[PDB]
User: What shape does this take?
Amino acid sequence: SGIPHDHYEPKTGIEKWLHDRLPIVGLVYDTIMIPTPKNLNWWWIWGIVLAFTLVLQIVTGIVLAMHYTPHVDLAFASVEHIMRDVNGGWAMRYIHANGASLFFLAVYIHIFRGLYYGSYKAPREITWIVGMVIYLLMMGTAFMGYVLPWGQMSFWGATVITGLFGAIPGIGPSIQAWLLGGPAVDNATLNRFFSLHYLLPFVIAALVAIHIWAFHTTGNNNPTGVEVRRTAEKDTLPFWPYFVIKDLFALALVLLGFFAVVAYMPNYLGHPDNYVQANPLSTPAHIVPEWYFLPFYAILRAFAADVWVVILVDGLTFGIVDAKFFGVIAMFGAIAVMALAPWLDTSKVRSGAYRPKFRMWFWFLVLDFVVLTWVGAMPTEYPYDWISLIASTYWFAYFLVILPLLGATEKPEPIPASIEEDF
Amino acid sequence: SGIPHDHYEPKTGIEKWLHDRLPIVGLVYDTIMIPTPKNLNWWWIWGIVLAFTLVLQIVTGIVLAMHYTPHVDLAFASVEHIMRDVNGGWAMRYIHANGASLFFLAVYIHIFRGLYYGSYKAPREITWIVGMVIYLLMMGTAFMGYVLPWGQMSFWGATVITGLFGAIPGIGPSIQAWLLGGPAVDNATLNRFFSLHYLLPFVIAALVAIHIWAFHTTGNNNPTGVEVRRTAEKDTLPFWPYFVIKDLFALALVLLGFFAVVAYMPNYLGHPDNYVQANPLSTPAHIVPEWYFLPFYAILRAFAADVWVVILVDGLTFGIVDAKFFGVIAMFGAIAVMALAPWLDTSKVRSGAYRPKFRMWFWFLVLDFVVLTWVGAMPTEYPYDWISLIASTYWFAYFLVILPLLGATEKPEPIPASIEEDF
Amino acid sequence: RRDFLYHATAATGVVVTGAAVWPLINQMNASADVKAMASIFVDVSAVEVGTQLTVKWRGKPVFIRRRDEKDIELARSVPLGALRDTSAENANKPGAEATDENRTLPAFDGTNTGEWLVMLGVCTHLGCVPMGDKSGDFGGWFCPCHGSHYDSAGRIRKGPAPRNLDIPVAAFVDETTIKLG
Amino acid sequence: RRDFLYHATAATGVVVTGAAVWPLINQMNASADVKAMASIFVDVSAVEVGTQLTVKWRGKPVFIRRRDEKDIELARSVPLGALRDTSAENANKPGAEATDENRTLPAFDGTNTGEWLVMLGVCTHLGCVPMGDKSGDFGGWFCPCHGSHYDSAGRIRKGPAPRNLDIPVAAFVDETTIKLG
Amino acid sequence: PDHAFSFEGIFGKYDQAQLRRGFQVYNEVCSACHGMKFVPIRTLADDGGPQLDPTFVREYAAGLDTIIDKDSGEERDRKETDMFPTRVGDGMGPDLSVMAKARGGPEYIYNYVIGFEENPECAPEGIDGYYYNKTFQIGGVPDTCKDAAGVKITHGSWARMPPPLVDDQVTYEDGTPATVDQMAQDVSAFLMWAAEPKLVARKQMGLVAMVMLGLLSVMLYLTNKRLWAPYKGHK
Amino acid sequence: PDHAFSFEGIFGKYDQAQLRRGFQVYNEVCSACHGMKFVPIRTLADDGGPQLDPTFVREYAAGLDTIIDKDSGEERDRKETDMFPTRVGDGMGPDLSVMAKARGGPEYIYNYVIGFEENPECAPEGIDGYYYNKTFQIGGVPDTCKDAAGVKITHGSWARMPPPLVDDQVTYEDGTPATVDQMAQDVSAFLMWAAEPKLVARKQMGLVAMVMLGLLSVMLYLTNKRLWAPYKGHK
Ligand code: HEC
Ligand code: HEC
Ligand code: HEC
Ligand code: HEC
Ligand code: HEC
Ligand code: HEC
Ligand code: FES
Ligand code: FES
Assistant: This one.
């Protein structure tokens, strides 16, 4: 059971004088020969993808910062200095910019893999909490970063996603001014964002430290509602070399596609308007902040008192909870409820591979995510308003009511024993 | 023996559900209730001082970077923007600038405490190695940082301490250009230095991580040549609350003095010429890089073929080893030999409190350090040249020959037993 | 005493910690160079009355647009009913009803109001810049960030934006100038 | 085979890693905007021959100083013996001996050398700027960074600096100009 | 058909004669109003695009406007190391440094320059000082051409730029019919260069990396199939 | 004796009348050649120093040179938000923004302005265009005054600045003998302000922190003495 196999430091004198600093003991006993089940599909790779992508972003950023100058008058020029003069330039920038896209794409699949195979269910709450914390940090990071080029979309995205904090009453304008460094956006905001943007990744790495510490102490989830049967465990092959090699193969494929993009379709995920300098006096059409924030942008700009299911007219009972504040609360709740999940699913069961109704609702949820992604880009004119309202309502409904009802009446399936599934 | 007292997680349900993430187990069992001897004097505090100073510097820097603009045309102006407009300004800058001074002062006492009480002697080699690595990183950091204000001393200090790398043959100019971003100093160097300067502290923290991991696995030295007698150990009170409170008291005193300086004598340790903008066309008199690099500056500019003990005329046997390269090697060796110490002292003994000859030689070494500090500021005219040569020669002599001879014939003292020294 | 001394040491440590933390949260506030926040003299100077005029100030645009009769009549024909924000955000006067007579502007040092209207070109939803030049579904301004329809006089309509376009404190400089501040 | 396949996978991984690392070490090299490194036309234009003239170029100063007879005679009276660097660093000619006849400069398009001397104002020790205007213990230049005494013609003396002050490639523009590059 | 360029694909390293033609046009036509500050003059020798002769570059540079200085205010000789000039206002337009990315890009410029036909049969009078363009979409439209809800019934809108070229505005030294269409294509390619000069290097890097990573991935697949063999053989 | 200032110590928050006098002196004498770019004009209302009336500040600002713009080249009215002007060359000197720190500082300025006496009895002819000072140390010296190894025998050296003031150059509105010494002291204090405006806040913070930390340290000493009591009582 949970064989650590510390190696007893019996190799030789080198492995015996290393009794001063244990380090190799840690690596070997724990982070390399960690028994993992055999039943792992191709959905348990994306964590390696995320770690590599994080390293990539940190490196490329440390390189760019050697040529980026945070200032309204010299940011655009420095970015062009990069893409033209520097030796590698375009590569670093395109790899930095697009890799953010892959990062978020990979976390999406990392998260939805989790919702299916009960990875939030006990005893794996801490991992979930830490993951939501990370998600928040990395969203804030990417936001701070999209601003640095001082293009045109930078300015206005910052403007609105800071007016949010100002929507709330009493302490809105104060926070807004304390965050922007002033009444509106200017170089001060740029300096804050650069610093902050150059600091959070390390916090993320530490949090990834705790993320990895947790699911090593707590066994990796597995396609089944079963554990490694610790009591000797013919199942649960080790990590190295088997799963290391599997993950590296998938990672090679992913990097292949990523570099093909970088080299042929690099400006595809971007907004052309970010290639024109900023004008605080003129706003372009369809700001469309980005593609990894459209869901929450839509959940925000949906509630506007423009439907018979408009709960804003009812929330107006209290004269303080206006629309804006309502949408902001709705977004914060869209995330808080995803974090609260493990204490809402009242099921003494596990992976939805044995819960059909859950399968249907979950695929509807994935569809809802895609729809929200597609709607945040389209105007607030009919019919898109009804669509956004329906989708947000279903998100909240799933995460609040649907899981309890299932946990109550959702066991028409024969659960599998013997995690050694030699089929 | 080595009582960890994991606490068994018997407190309550909170301390029992924390069996998902051990964290509190680590803190309690290891990093708080770490048995430390009773025989500790006031020289075992400076590590807490260093940790706090590092945190202070990191914080103040993260704040400054919100207003500093890396560019030749806007650095000085941004520094003045800080010291005038910003709310706190002068405080952050003076605390950042002077705290570096305290940092190095504190590491000096941390290191010399070590040389006395055989803290480099086995089984504490890894700590020593890691400490020298750190010292290097933090020297490089402070150097990169003194440049950012783009004053006058910045430029020329950078110029010379980069011409060093160019002294060596074959791969000197290439490295020089690859480090400066060009033939000479300009904005590119500034960007590199800012980035680098804003990144190494985290590496230092990690290295401090390993630094703290090591001497927790390996017992804290103690005033004597004795261990905690693991086999139950009435000696070795715990860290918390006793030594925590002692260190915090000393730290309060130190911060008191430090803030008195910051508020009354802040520009004392500085160079006024760093308050005039840079002129690549005019060099001031007595550049005098700083005060924590004068020893090595002197060891460098001492060997010049201007004494009957001039080994440069002899090293000229090989036409490649000229003077400059000789001084550079001498400096790198001045540090490498301090790192090699634990394998040069051939003594099966410990703290020099029981080795008189060692006491005398060690106080001579401290005097040599002070002298080198005082000499790097004075010209290379007679008699200072002879002084610098003598001092460097004694440094090398100590660390190479003196310790072996002692380890041979240096045991006229009764060693103390029973680390419980109830005198 | 055990309790008193221990708790007092803890309290003093906490107080010092807070006194050290506050400035790390104060430096991010508006600095003195941002404190200035003063006025601007924009000269109307025959810009062909009826299309628009925009000028930068305080980091935001200040819209100075003449009036087109059709725009005017549409304005003056708006009863307070069915008007989201009837407060006439203009700070040059009290909270008087959001009426075009009060909402257009001072009268050149003369006596007339249905000819000029200078408001802050900042959407009250989240601070975007609406597009002018007769746009939207009400012959006024349209915000492209979320779709808020403004009217001729600038009062909010058809969108999430809660209130109309504010009007800063401004007076005239004897028939060719505007004072913003 | 076990050995072949495993070792080949490792080799390919290593190769890819290196191909990815190299640019992270290449970007820090001089960029194309630093590649330029071209020439400058400085006009002597009667600056009162005998004191000095300094101009910025390539990020370093280029010293153009006329000659003072006492400085000249001290120069021409220096035998190659007791001269640290006798190579005449000047790149406008071969490695001919560091003699004042070759070491002063071209002759205005005429025939004379003991009147002008333009060298690179960069100490060969570590690149500091020596102080001019008759300084040091040899009536020339003095480096304040470590104490290197230069002579009248710029040849190094009395210090760690190994070689004299180099002389870039320069020709005259017909009696009032200098071409640096 | 769509008149695809050379670079439109996995290959097509910027046929350079096209770019020299675009340069002949840009400096003689578009430069009168437009600028390219984000473009150094020394790039007309760098590989990939117009590999002109450096000496001609220095000549053409000295023959341009006067960019004064950064240290001592004095009208210099506009050395190549400087950037192309900037036309800012009073009847002038934006900067074309990266206009090929702020819009499939070059096709916009081609189909924009192409198309300035007379005013349609909805508003033949048109507007004073504004001219009509088939493809610009961010211009004003008269009320006579708008529908019932503000949308325009015209394909394009009214742009403030006049027609830049006639039937035979300039001569090509290489020998080629210099009609409007060829000039438009050429200048579009030149602007795409000015925006993406490092295109060919992009493509070559992409090829090299695709190849090396396919190799690595194949080898890893073999290693995986091997290691996992004794556990996937009976089923 | 040494004519210590007010701020020379643990107290001395910049007696403001002295600074107003120094301002009368600086704008009417030193400003002709020197500048203070690193100094905003609005600081003449901020506390600590000259708490002048804002309206006078705006007037004095509009009455200065013309600082053109940063966005649209056009000679503006020079609003207070801008910085003091800059005199750069052609018989002009450095910037006095932080000259009080690039040298005990203000004493240098006092003992420098003080001292321009005639040429000594080693070189009475002196030099053409250069004037003599007894305290500047970074100026040239004639060969007649140097020793055998280049060192000067004079106290100071020859500075390019002329004597700035005579016996009664300007009047003080408050009523005070405006001799040279008082003006020198006043202008020195003004420059020290221009360099260290946040001095008084520095001192008050230092006091507060010394106090709080002494308190904390005393309490920790008591706690230590207590905890370590049962182990240090028999000896
Ligand atoms: C002045 C006589 C011009 C010359 C000659 C050329 N251009 Fe221009 N251009 C000019 C103006 C005033 C504008 C702004 C138009 C507006 O309505 O805002 C432009 C615009 C362009 C654009 C941008 C179009 C867009 O979608 O915003 C392009 C791509 C452009 N012009 C191209 C172009 C070329 C290739 C030229 C030389 C052949 C050229 N223009 C000449 C003014 C003038
Ligand atoms: C031109 C007529 C001047 C006026 C009036 C004032 N100053 Fe000046 N100053 C001037 C020059 C050309 C120089 C450079 C001198 C040199 O030899 O390099 C200076 C220098 C100073 C300095 C710096 C001295 C030093 O050690 O470098 C100071 C502190 C100074 N001047 C002060 C000063 C004051 C207070 C004035 C008004 C009372 C003033 N100067 C007027 C030119 C001129
Ligand atoms: C060491 C510095 C650094 C790190 C670490 C870093 N970046 Fe950046 N980032 C930059 C710089 C510099 C820019 C501006 C240059 C650019 O846009 O490429 C930038 C810009 C961006 C952009 C906008 C790209 C563009 O071209 O508009 C995004 C998105 C972004 N960062 C996201 C991230 C995310 C997400 C992470 C990690 C979680 C990250 N970055 C890590 C330095 C860094
Ligand atoms: C909001 C949720 C969430 C986020 C965001 C998240 N994780 Fe996870 N992660 C999980 C969960 C749940 C598991 C499953 C743990 C288990 O099975 O015991 C997991 C597992 C892992 C694993 C091991 C198994 C696997 O799925 O590969 C790795 C490695 C990992 N995460 C890395 C990362 C990294 C690196 C990041 C970010 C840079 C990240 N994760 C972000 C929740 C998250
Ligand atoms: C987050 C950024 C950051 C960190 C971390 C940081 N600094 Fe700095 N440092 C700066 C900035 C910004 C400046 C320039 C402003 C200034 O000089 O105060 C600077 C300047 C300096 C200076 C010159 C001070 C002066 O005023 O001339 C020194 C010395 C220095 N740093 C040393 C250090 C050392 C040693 C460390 C930690 C080991 C450190 N710094 C940590 C940001 C930082
Ligand atoms: C080059 C040597 C060196 C450097 C530099 C150094 N250390 Fe140490 N450190 C030591 C040695 C040796 C010991 C003694 C360990 C023992 O007694 O087991 C030690 C002990 C310590 C201790 C515990 C006992 C004590 O002396 O306080 C702390 C805490 C500590 N170091 C922190 C730091 C921090 C933080 C830094 C830098 C930011 C640092 N040290 C830099 C060598 C070094
Ligand atoms: S920001 Fe103006 S409507 Fe959303
Ligand atoms: S740098 Fe010129 S002598 Fe040391």
Summary: The CA atoms of residues 84 and 156 of chain D lie 6 Å apart. Chain D has four helices and ten strands.
